[PDB]
C-alpha cells in the first residue's frame, strides 16, 4: 500500500536550523499533490508547508514565515524541507502526506470514499538548553 | 383640611449604564482562521453585555 515514511527529527538548540524528510512509495509523484504538517502536543495538527504536484505553488505557511526551503526530488520521490533561526514554539511533531484523493458526499449521499495519503510523524524538539 | 382627589398623568422613564463592556463578538466571527471540525475551537463568554 501507499506509505510515507517521515525522518529528521531530533532535538535541536534554537536559534539553529536542521531538516527532514519524507520518503513517499506506492504512487507516482506527480499524481498527487504532497505537504508537511505540525502537531503542537496540546493543540490540533497545523499546515505548514506542501509543494505543488509539479512544483506551481509550493505555497507555504506565515507561521513559520520565511524559515523555509522546501524541495521534492523525483528520482526518489521524496520530499524535504529545513528549519532555520529556531525558536521552542518550533517544537512540535511534523507530518506527511499528500493529497488529490478528497470524499465525494452528495446531498444525503454516501460519505464514504477515497481520502488522502498520510505518513508517519517525526518529533522536533527546539530548547536552549543542552542533553544528557 | 382635605385629601387629594387630585389625578395627574404620569409619565414612564427607564434608566441604566451606557453598555460599557460589549461582548467580543468580533473576535468569533470576524476572524482570521478557524479551527477543523474535529478540534473545534471553544471560547468562554460572561460579564459582558452581548
Known amino acids: 500500500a501507499v506509505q510515507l515514511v517521515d525522518s529528521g527529527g531530533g532535538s535541536v538548540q534554537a536559534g539553529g536550523s536542521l531538516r527532514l524528510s519524507c520518503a513517499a512509495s506506492?504512487?507516482?509523484?506527480?499524481?498527487?499533490?504532497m505537504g508537511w504538517y505540525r502537531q503542537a502536543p496540546g493543540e490540533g495538527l497545523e499546515w505548514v508547508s506542501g509543494?505543488?504536484?509539479?512544483?506551481?505553488?509550493?505555497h507555504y505557511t506565515d507561521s513559520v514565515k520565511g524559515r523555509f526551503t522546501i524541495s521534492r526530488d523525483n528520482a526518489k520521490k521524496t520530499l524535504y524541507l529545513q528549519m532555520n533561526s529556531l525558536k521552542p514554539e518550533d517544537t512540535a511533531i511534523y507530518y506527511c502526506?499528500?493529497?488529490?484523493?478528497?470524499?465525494?458526499?452528495?446531498?444525503?449521499?454516501?460519505?464514504?470514499?477515497?481520502?488522502?495519503?498520510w505518513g508517519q510523524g517525526t518529533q522536533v524538539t527546539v530548547s536552549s538548553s543542552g542533553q544528557a | 383640611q382635605t385629601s387629594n382627589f387630585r389625578v395627574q398623568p404620569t409619565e414612564s422613564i427607564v434608566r441604566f449604564p451606557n453598555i460599557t463592556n460589549l461582548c467580543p463578538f468580533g473576535e468569533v466571527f470576524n476572524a482570521t482562521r478557524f479551527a477543523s471540525v474535529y478540534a473545534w475551537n471553544r471560547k468562554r463568554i460572561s460579564n459582558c453585555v452581548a
Open positions: 509543494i505543488n504536484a509539479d512544483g506551481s505553488n509550493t
Open positions: 506506492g504512487y507516482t509523484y506527480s499524481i498527487c499533490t
Open positions: 502526506a499528500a493529497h488529490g484523493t478528497y470524499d465525494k458526499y452528495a446531498p444525503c449521499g454516501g460519505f464514504a470514499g477515497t481520502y488522502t495519503y
